[PDB]
Design an enzyme around this catalytic site. Structure first.
Site, short mmCIF file in Angstrom:
data_model
loop_
_atom_site.label_atom_id
_atom_site.label_comp_id
_atom_site.label_asym_id
_atom_site.label_seq_id
_atom_site.Cartn_x
_atom_site.Cartn_y
_atom_site.Cartn_z
N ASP A 20 1.44 -13.57 14.45
CA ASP A 20 0.17 -13.29 13.80
C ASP A 20 -0.77 -12.74 14.87
O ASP A 20 -0.53 -11.63 15.37
CB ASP A 20 -0.34 -14.57 13.09
CG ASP A 20 -1.39 -14.29 12.01
OD1 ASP A 20 -2.13 -13.30 12.12
OD2 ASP A 20 -1.46 -15.08 11.03
N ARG B 156 -7.19 -3.20 3.13
CA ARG B 156 -8.25 -3.87 3.88
C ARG B 156 -7.94 -3.76 5.37
O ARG B 156 -6.78 -3.61 5.77
CB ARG B 156 -8.36 -5.34 3.50
CG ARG B 156 -7.11 -6.13 3.81
CD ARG B 156 -7.29 -7.63 3.66
NE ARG B 156 -8.30 -8.14 4.59
CZ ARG B 156 -8.79 -9.38 4.55
NH1 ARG B 156 -8.34 -10.25 3.65
NH2 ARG B 156 -9.73 -9.74 5.41
N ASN C 39 -7.46 -5.66 8.92
CA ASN C 39 -7.04 -6.99 9.36
C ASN C 39 -7.37 -7.16 10.84
O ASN C 39 -8.52 -6.96 11.24
CB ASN C 39 -5.56 -7.26 9.07
CG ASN C 39 -5.24 -8.75 9.11
OD1 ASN C 39 -6.12 -9.58 8.91
ND2 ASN C 39 -3.97 -9.09 9.36
N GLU D 263 -9.47 -17.21 11.52
CA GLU D 263 -8.87 -16.01 12.12
C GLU D 263 -9.83 -15.38 13.13
O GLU D 263 -11.00 -15.75 13.24
CB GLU D 263 -8.51 -14.97 11.04
CG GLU D 263 -7.04 -14.95 10.64
CD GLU D 263 -6.14 -14.31 11.68
OE1 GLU D 263 -4.98 -14.00 11.34
OE2 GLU D 263 -6.60 -14.10 12.82
N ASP E 232 -2.78 -7.12 -1.21
CA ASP E 232 -1.69 -7.90 -1.78
C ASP E 232 -0.40 -7.77 -0.98
O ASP E 232 0.69 -7.77 -1.56
CB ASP E 232 -1.47 -7.50 -3.25
CG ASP E 232 -1.11 -6.03 -3.42
OD1 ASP E 232 -1.44 -5.22 -2.53
OD2 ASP E 232 -0.51 -5.69 -4.46
N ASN F 113 -1.62 -6.94 12.84
CA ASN F 113 -2.05 -8.20 13.45
C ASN F 113 -2.29 -8.10 14.96
O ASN F 113 -2.93 -7.15 15.40
CB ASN F 113 -1.06 -9.30 13.06
CG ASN F 113 -1.67 -10.26 12.07
OD1 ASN F 113 -2.85 -10.59 12.20
ND2 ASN F 113 -0.91 -10.69 11.07
MG LIG Z 1 -3.93 -12.33 11.79
#
Ligand SMILES: [Mg+2]
Ligand SMILES: [Hg+2]
Ligand SMILES: [Hg+2]
Length: 307
Positions: free
Chosen positions: A211, A107, A109, A17, A127, A159
């Protein structure tokens, strides 16, 4: 068609990532969002290194003006890591700010600097789940005096991010929405408004989930399609226009960054993590890193974070 090369030297990642191309050192940095590791690849010298921490990580971006230092995420903290790019652990860690001190199961990202050097990043439940799961994330930027500002709530999986060359638009992905949104971006106040869908996966029979993303010099967005085995090229001049599709062998394509000496080699990360509700058998899900050439476009050097 384009050439898609598996980078054998790099191996397989659980969830590779956050690719970032530093153009002055011709070096790719990236993360694994599950394995708590940072990664460095120097393609011209075939050099690979990794760095271990004990918190979940999701981006790595060089700190403007400070060689050997990187702005990273450590769970919910934005931090500066002092790292020589080769030792298996950081030399030191300097916390900057915890974006969500009282949300114990969130969290950070995906994150990226806007063209002015301001870090933008968003959160998610650790989660989180698709198509439906807990929706607890928000979108932030890190501004003056090391305080974050919030720009959007109700984000399932924070994202990919990109900005138009004229600094009038921002593009943003919540994977759970299965679309890319565009916003009017005010570079002077660092605020976004007039959120509207740019590209909606179900309108074009695109499988999977958006994403990471990046933008090329012509203004086209390149979007990673997790559980779609592809990257897609979409217009920013007109809504809902699919310009092209490039198949990537790994089904779980995660993110994208332009690199190479001429910024025309598209690096593509993927995830080998085998999920219980996958559209692809386990034998197909590996997590390699790929390089795509022959797209006929150039991107931009990765922007460093200014503090
Ligand atoms: Mg991502
Ligand atoms: Hg590191
Ligand atoms: Hg680092």
């Amino acid at each position: 068609g384009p050439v898609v090369e598996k980078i054998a030297e790099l191996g397989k990642y659980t969830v590779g990532e956050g690719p970032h191309w530093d153009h002055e050192t011709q070096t790719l940095y990236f993360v694994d969002t599950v394995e708590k590791t940072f990664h460095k690849y120097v393609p011209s010298q075939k050099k690979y290194t990794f760095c271990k921490v004990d918190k979940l990580v999701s981006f790595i971006i060089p700190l403007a003006g400070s060689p050997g230092r990187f702005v990273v995420s450590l769970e919910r903290e934005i931090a500066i890591l002092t790292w020589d790019g080769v030792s298996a652990a950081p030399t030191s860690i300097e916390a900057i700010v915890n974006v969500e001190p009282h949300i114990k199961n969130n969290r950070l990202n995906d994150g990226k600097a806007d063209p002015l050097g301001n870090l933008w990043t968003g959160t998610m439940a650790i989660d989180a789940g698709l198509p439906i799961g807990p929706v607890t994330g928000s979108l932030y930027h890190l501004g003056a005096d090391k305080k974050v500002k919030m720009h959007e709530s109700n984000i399932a999986i924070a994202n990919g991010l990109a900005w138009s060359n004229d600094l009038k638009k921002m593009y943003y992905i919540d994977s759970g929405k299965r679309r890319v949104d565009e916003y009017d971006y005010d570079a002077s106040t660092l605020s976004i408004s007039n959120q509207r869908p740019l590209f909606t996966f179900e309108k074009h029979e695109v499988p999977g989930y958006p994403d990471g993303q990046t933008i090329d010099e012509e203004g086209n967005l390149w979007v990673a399609v997790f559980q779609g085995q592809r990257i897609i090229k979409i217009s920013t001049q007109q809504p809902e226009v699919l310009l092209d599709t490039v198949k990537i062998p790994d089904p779980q394509v995660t993110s994208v960054a332009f690199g190479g000496p001429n910024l025309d080699e598209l690096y593509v990360t993927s995830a080998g993590l085998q999920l219980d509700d996958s559209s692809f058998d386990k034998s197909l899900v590996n997590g390699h890193v790929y390089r795509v050439t022959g797209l006929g476009v150039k991107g931009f050097a990765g922007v460093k974070v200014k503090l």
